[PDB]
């Protein structure tokens, strides 16, 4: 997973046009380049080493727990590419890790603690996670899908009548986010503007994997008395103010 993260990180910097990661330090202090990316589970292969291969007395590296930590991938990114002293904040959303990471990165940038942040999320597929997800019946049953005549390239079918669990995958995804003024001063390609980002919980429950409508609060507004438009939504009023 750390290999996937390193590749995705260099490719994200190259998408941002930064061939040399130290080019940030021409424009921002070393304390203003951070890495707020994360993982749902982290180094599951290192956890397998620790919990299974060491129990079996197989030859396992002595620093396997280091590779098992979820912030180790960010640590390796900083140790091999960035060498920044900016904020490092490793989220764990377990499935929303990347969007939560974008949230953390944006608040980090807007608080002034960083000017560049490496956000994103990564995860790896392994025997043990696959078996556990099967036990929780979260993933589709391949035997049942073959019985239904479904090929692997058509087993993952969101929104259909016959959706029966998700298709577990592996990999990483990284984005380089920064202030608009920094992007324009550096002359980097501004691919998008992150206008909004939010995280939320649902309610009382006794089912962790049960999804909920907690993120509906992103659309919250008051509607008791709308007899007149709010002036603040009007662009020219804010412009004269």
């Amino acid at each position: 997973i750390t290999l996937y993260v390193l590749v995705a990180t260099v490719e994200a910097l190259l998408s941002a046009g930064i061939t040399d990661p130290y080019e940030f330090y021409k424009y921002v202090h070393v304390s203003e380049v951070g890495n707020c990316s994360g993982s749902g589970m982290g180094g599951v292969s290192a956890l397998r080493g620790m919990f299974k291969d060491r129990y079996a007395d197989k030859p396992v590296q002595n620093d396997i727990l280091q590779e098992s930590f979820i912030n180790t991938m960010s640590a390796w990114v900083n140790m091999l590419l960035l060498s920044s002293s900016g904020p490092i904040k490793t989220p764990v959303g377990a499935c929303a890790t990347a969007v939560e990471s974008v949230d953390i990165g944006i608040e980090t940038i807007l608080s002034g603690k960083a000017k560049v942040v490496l956000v994103g999320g990564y995860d790896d597929f392994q025997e043990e996670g696959s078996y556990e997800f099967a036990n929780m019946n979260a993933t589709s049953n391949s035997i049942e899908e073959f019985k239904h005549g479904r090929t692997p390239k058509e087993m993952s079918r969101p929104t259909t009548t016959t959706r029966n669990g998700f298709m577990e995958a592996q990999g990483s995804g990284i984005q380089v986010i920064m202030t608009a003024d920094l992007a324009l001063k550096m002359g980097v390609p501004i691919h998008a503007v992150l206008a909004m980002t939010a995280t939320a919980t649902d309610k009382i429950g006794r089912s962790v994997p049960a999804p909920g409508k907690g993120i509906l609060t992103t659309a919250r507004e008051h509607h008791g008395n709308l007899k007149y438009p709010s002036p603040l939504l009007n662009i020219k009023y804010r412009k004269r103010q």
Partner: peptide, 7 residues
């Protein structure tokens, strides 16, 4: 969405 909770 109360009529008295905003003003």
């Amino acid at each position: 969405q109360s009529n008295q909770s905003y003003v």
